[PDB]
Swiss-Prot record:
Component of the telomerase ribonucleoprotein (RNP) complex that is essential for the replication of chromosome termini. Is a component of the double-stranded telomeric DNA-binding TRF1 complex which is involved in the regulation of telomere length by cis-inhibition of telomerase. Also acts as a single-stranded telomeric DNA-binding protein and thus may act as a downstream effector of the TRF1 complex and may transduce information about telomere maintenance and/or length to the telomere terminus. Residues 28-43 are annotated as: DNA-binding. Ubiquitous. Belongs to the telombin family. The lineage of its organism: Eukaryota, Metazoa, Chordata, Craniata, Vertebrata. It is linked to Tumor predisposition syndrome 3: An autosomal dominant disorder characterized by an increased risk for the development of various types of benign and malignant neoplasms throughout life, with age-dependent penetrance. Affected individuals can develop neoplasms involving epithelial, mesenchymal, and neuronal tissues, as well as lymphoid and myeloid cancers. The disorder is associated with elongated telomeres. This is Protection of telomeres protein 1. Homodimer or homooligomer. Component of the shelterin complex (telosome) composed of TERF1, TERF2, TINF2, TERF2IP, ACD and POT1. Binds single-stranded telomeric DNA as a monomer. Associated component of the telomerase holoenzyme complex. Found in a complex with TERF1, TINF2 and TNKS1. Interacts with TNKS1. Forms heterodimers with ACD. Identified in a complex with ACD and single-stranded telomeric DNA. It comes from Homo sapiens (Human). The gene is POT1. It is found in: Nucleus; Chromosome, Telomere.
Length: 68
DNA sequence: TTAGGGTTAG
């Protein structure tokens, strides 16, 4: 069954595959990086004010999460 | 792989 243990973002260590929640404190719209994939940058914050950065890579915009 | 948020001088 579907499950998610939302936990303060600081606990999300490298190599871990996680299910999370947060407000977007800052983000860049999808832009083409040196690589082949457009990179969208997102800074997210949870209810405990803890932060996480996300780099969302895709060859196009539509494949990425929808944020405005 | 890249990038991995913060002012151009147009």
């Amino acid at each position: 069954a579907t499950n998610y243990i939302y936990t303060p973002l600081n606990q999300l260590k490298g190599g871990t595959i996680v299910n999370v929640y947060g407000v977007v404190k800052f983000f860049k719209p999808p832009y083409l990086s040196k690589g082949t994939d457009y990179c969208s940058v997102v800074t997210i914050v949870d209810q405990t004010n803890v932060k996480l950065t996300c780099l969302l890579f895709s060859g196009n915009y539509e494949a990425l999460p929808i944020i405005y």
